[PDB]
Amino acid sequence: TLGEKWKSRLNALGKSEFQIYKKSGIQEVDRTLAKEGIKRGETDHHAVSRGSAKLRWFVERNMVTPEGKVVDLGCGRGGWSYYCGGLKNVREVKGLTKGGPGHEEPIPMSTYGWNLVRLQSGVDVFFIPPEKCDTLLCDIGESSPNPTVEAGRTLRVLNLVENWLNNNTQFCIKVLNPYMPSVIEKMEALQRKYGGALVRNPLSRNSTHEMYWVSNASGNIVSSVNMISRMLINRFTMRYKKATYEPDVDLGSGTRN
């Protein structure tokens, strides 16, 4: 497929060439100071990761309207959870991850609405009973040189999420590899059953073909992905181009009643 061609080409790049391509013409969050602040123990204002700004991109465009009880599957440090904790119609946020050595452990913060957020690692979302929620978030998906490996991992995530959804469910779910036939088929059925569409976030690096399945979006799946495969391929042709930066998000401080 067109995406697989992109994948072959990506795997043939040298080290230096990869790092450059990875950032060419993408959008980037200015994280220097937020990171230095967290390192000094600062728990107010800062986003634990660039995932906050990433999720904000979708939310400010109403592609996902987090509300009620939010479940963040694979929350990592908590970037997505903490951001939702400060959102108007959100009442509760539950984030889950593996954590442990060689894995991202959630960081305790005092950002706005932190008291509405509960994080816990040592949990493998794939084998715990599904819970009820109003919005389901999931940013799971480890990339690999081999697209068939990504296809399976992706299909696992899609089936995992299919269990946590009902209808009225707001959702933003990462789809690591959306171009492999197997994943495309699944997405067509899921779209057919739960709506929404796939969207490319300008903050995603060129090194990944990741797209997110957002509930409040529309668009033909096959058409979605290809449009993006062509983009990523075109970006290979770029010379001496870097990312455009933007200020990170300020998450406030304070509790919510």
The one segment of 15-23, 56-64, 90-98, 240-248 that binds ligand SAH by CB under 6 A: 90-98
Q: For ligand SAH, which residue has the nearest CB? A: 51
Q: Can you give the C-alpha Rg of the chain in angstroms?
A: 18
Q: Is 82 annotated as a binding residue?
A: no
The one segment of 94-102, 190-198, 220-228, 231-239 that binds ligand SAH by CB under 6 A: 94-102
- 210 an active-site residue? yes
Q: Does 139 bind ligand SAH (CB under 6 A)?
A: yes
Per-position DSSP letters for 61-111, written without gaps between them: TTSS---EEEEEET-TTSHHHHHHHTSTTEEEEEEE---STTSPPP-----
SS3 label, residue 55: helix
Q: Does 205 bind ligand SAH (CB under 6 A)?
A: no
Query: What residues does 68 pair with on adjacent strands?
Result: 90
Q: Does 49 bind ligand SAH (CB under 6 A)?
A: yes
The one segment of 23-31, 47-55, 185-193, 226-234 that binds ligand SAH by CB under 6 A: 47-55
Q: Does 80 bind ligand SAH (CB under 6 A)?
A: yes
How many whole angstroms separate alpha carbon 115 and alpha carbon 148? 41
Q: Shortest approach of ligand SAH to residue 146 CB, angstroms?
A: 18
Query: What residues does 94 pair with on adjacent strands?
Result: 71, 118
Q: Does 124 bind ligand SAH (CB under 6 A)?
A: yes
Q: Shortest approach of ligand SAH to residue 160 CB, angstroms?
A: 8
Q: Does 76 bind ligand SAH (CB under 6 A)?
A: yes
Shorter beta-carbon distance to ligand SAH: residue 174 or 186:
174
How many whole angstroms separate alpha carbon 176 and alpha carbon 17? 22
- 139 an active-site residue? yes
Q: Does 46 bind ligand SAH (CB under 6 A)?
A: no
Q: Is 212 annotated as a binding residue?
A: yes
Q: Is 26 annotated as a binding residue?
A: no
Q: Identify which of 73, 79, 78 has the alpha carbon closest to the alpha carbon of residue 96.
A: 73
The one segment of 3-11, 123-131, 162-170, 209-217 that binds ligand SAH by CB under 6 A: 123-131
Q: Is 114 annotated as a binding residue?
A: no
Largest CA distance in the chain: 53
Q: Shortest approach of ligand SAH to residue 233 CB, angstroms?
A: 26
- 88 an active-site residue? no
Query: What residues does 92 pair with on adjacent strands?
Result: 69
Q: Is 98 annotated as a binding residue?
A: yes
Q: Does 147 bind ligand SAH (CB under 6 A)?
A: no
Catalytically active residues, by annotation? 54, 139, 174, 210
Which residues of this protein are in contact with ligand SAH, per CB under 6 A?
48-49, 51, 74-80, 96-98, 103-104, 123-126, 139-140
